[PDB]
Amino acid sequence: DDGGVVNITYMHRLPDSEGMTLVNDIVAKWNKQHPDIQVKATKFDGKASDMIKKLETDVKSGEAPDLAQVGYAELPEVFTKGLLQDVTQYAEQYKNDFASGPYSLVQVGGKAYGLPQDTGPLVYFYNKAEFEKLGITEIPQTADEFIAAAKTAAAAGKYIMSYQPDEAGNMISGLAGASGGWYKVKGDSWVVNTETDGSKATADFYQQLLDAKAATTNPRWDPSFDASIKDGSLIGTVAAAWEAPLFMTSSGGTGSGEWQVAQLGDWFGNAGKTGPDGGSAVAVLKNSKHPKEAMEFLDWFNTQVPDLVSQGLVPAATTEDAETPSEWSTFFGGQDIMKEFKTANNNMGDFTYMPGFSAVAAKMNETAAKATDGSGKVADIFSDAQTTSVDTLKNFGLSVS
Numbered sequence: 079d080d081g082g083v084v085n086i087t088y089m090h091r092l093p094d095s096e097g098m099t100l101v102n103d104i105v106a107k108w109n110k111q112h113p114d115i116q117v118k119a120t121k122f123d124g125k126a127s128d129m130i131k132k133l134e135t136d137v138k139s140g141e142a143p144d145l146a147q148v149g150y151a152e153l154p155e156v157f158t159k160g161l162l163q164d165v166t167q168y169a170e171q172y173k174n175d176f177a178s179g180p181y182s183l184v185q186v187g188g189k190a191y192g193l194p195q196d197t198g199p200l201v202y203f204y205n206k207a208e209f210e211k212l213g214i215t216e217i218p219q220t221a222d223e224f225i226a227a228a229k230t231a232a233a234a235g236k237y238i239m240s241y242q243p244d245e246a247g248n249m250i251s252g253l254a255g256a257s258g259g260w261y262k263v264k265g266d267s268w269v270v271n272t273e274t275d276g277s278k279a280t281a282d283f284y285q286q287l288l289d290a291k292a293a294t295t296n297p298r299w300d301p302s303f304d305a306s307i308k309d310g311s312l313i314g315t316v317a318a319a320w321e322a323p324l325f326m327t328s329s330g331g332t333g334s335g336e337w338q339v340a341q342l343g344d345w346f347g348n349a350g351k352t353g354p355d356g357g358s359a360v361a362v363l364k365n366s367k368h369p370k371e372a373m374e375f376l377d378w379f380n381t382q383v384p385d386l387v388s389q390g391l392v393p394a395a396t397t398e399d400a401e402t403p404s405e406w407s408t409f410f411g412g413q414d415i416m417k418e419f420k421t422a423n424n425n426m427g428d429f430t431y432m433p434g435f436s437a438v439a440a441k442m443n444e445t446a447a448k449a450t451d452g453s454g455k456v457a458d459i460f461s462d463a464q465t466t467s468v469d470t471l472k473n474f475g476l477s478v479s
């Protein structure tokens with residue numbers, strides 16, 4: 079057996095914002111109960127896309143943590159780079175605590191590499207009061223009706239959509255992906271087609287909005303995005319469900335009591351489905367000496383539903399129902415928004431991510447930015463994604479048909 083005290087490290091990229099139950103306060107509850115398995119949790123200091131790059135460096139140097147947050151979209155990539163540890167025999171014991179979909183997303187070739195933590199269905203946030211002032215009395219359900227409403231809003235200096243060039247690889251991929259995968263293994267080779275009917279419909283929607291100067295073009299993570307919420311100009315947008323508390327904080331309180339969550343309309347060729355934008359597992363890394371206890375702790379951590387919800391997560395756990403915090407329902411006009419998140423999750427399309435998708439997302443963002451001043455077309459996001467996807471697979475030494 080192990081010695082009396084096993085020490086585990088967990089690196090995460092949860093927000094830990096004001097109002098949230100901090101990861102360290104969650105882990106402190108574990109540590110008090112379990113002197114036998116002590117956990118040191120740290121938040122990655124850096125932007126999200128740099129985390130798996132640090133993990134790569136640290137695995138090689140022998141400085142890696144036992145446990146690390148790894149997006150579902152990132153897992154095939156870090157697996158292919160040899161950064162993970164097969165923990166199938168441990169995952170199997172905790173399987174029943176988690177939804178089957180998310181659980182399948184910690185697997186590669188029927189081997190499990192950690193446990194699922196949250197999901198990222200796309201939804202629509204809007205200020206119902208401001209919609210009413212503009213005469214928009216229903217969420218438009220077709221792209222054409224939405225675009226018409228958006229032009230009405232824009233003429234009034236309001237915007238019912240944002241175009242987020244720094245999120246094209248996550249949000250726009252998810253919107254296009256709602257109606258069909260881009261990546262499939264066909265035996266000895268990958269087959270790539272990022273130019274699906276969904277990609278085309280998604281491009282057309284944003285193109286018409288941008289041409290009409292009827293969507294904001296501020297990068298999501300820039301202060302200019304927050305300012306557009308605070309100043310009342312951005313009154314509607316697609317958002318990943320985990321954005322809720324982030325968006326609330328970014329608003330400064332503007333529109334509190336008037337915001338609502340709706341399912342995505344049929345704006346993206348999505349035909350009643352939504353798609354994933356982020357969502358993460360926590361994986362056990364290659365040279366962790368204590369995979370059993372890492373997974374023991376992880377199962378506990380990933381089933382602390384209310385605490386995870388406080389971080390904005392839509393938990394993968396099925397051990398208890400997630401409930402909308404009182405502060406959130408108050409901001410969102412009394413709405414039980416978690417119910418909308420659950421509906422969205424249940425209507426979210428499956429989407430395989432090729433190993434190396436980080437390069438695809440990088441290219442998507444670069445090309446997306448060209449569309450903001452009309453130097454590029456929105457459709458080029460997807461034609462470039464096609465080429466970068468094929469190139470990246472080949473760079474990994476993988477066969478492409």
Ligand SMILES: CC(=O)N[C@H]1[C@H](O[C@H]2[C@@H](O)[C@@H](CO)O[C@@H](O[C@H]3[C@H](O)[C@@H](O)[C@H](O)O[C@@H]3CO)[C@@H]2O)O[C@H](CO)[C@@H](O)[C@@H]1O[C@@H]1O[C@H](CO)[C@H](O)[C@H](O)[C@H]1O
Nearest residue numbers: 092093125126127149244248299320356357358436439440
């Ligand atoms: C899918 C994901 O991990 N989303 C993150 C989100 O990540 C994007 C942002 O960091 C933007 C900032 O510009 O960068 C994007 O990466 C780009 C990068 O900007 C380019 O320079 C480079 O060339 O390409 C990359 C793409 O490879 C990131 O993708 O960041 C937000 C805010 O920090 C995160 O919240 C979000 O992750 C989700 O966080 C939730 C907690 O708030 C949950 O953990 C959820 O599961 C995560 O998916």
Ligand code: NA
Nearest residue numbers: 265266267479
């Ligand atoms: Na073949």
Ligand code: NA
Nearest residue numbers: 445458459462
């Ligand atoms: Na291009």
Ligand SMILES: [Zn+2]
Nearest residue numbers: 111112113114
């Ligand atoms: Zn114990």
Ligand SMILES: [Zn+2]
Nearest residue numbers: 080367368371
């Ligand atoms: Zn051990």
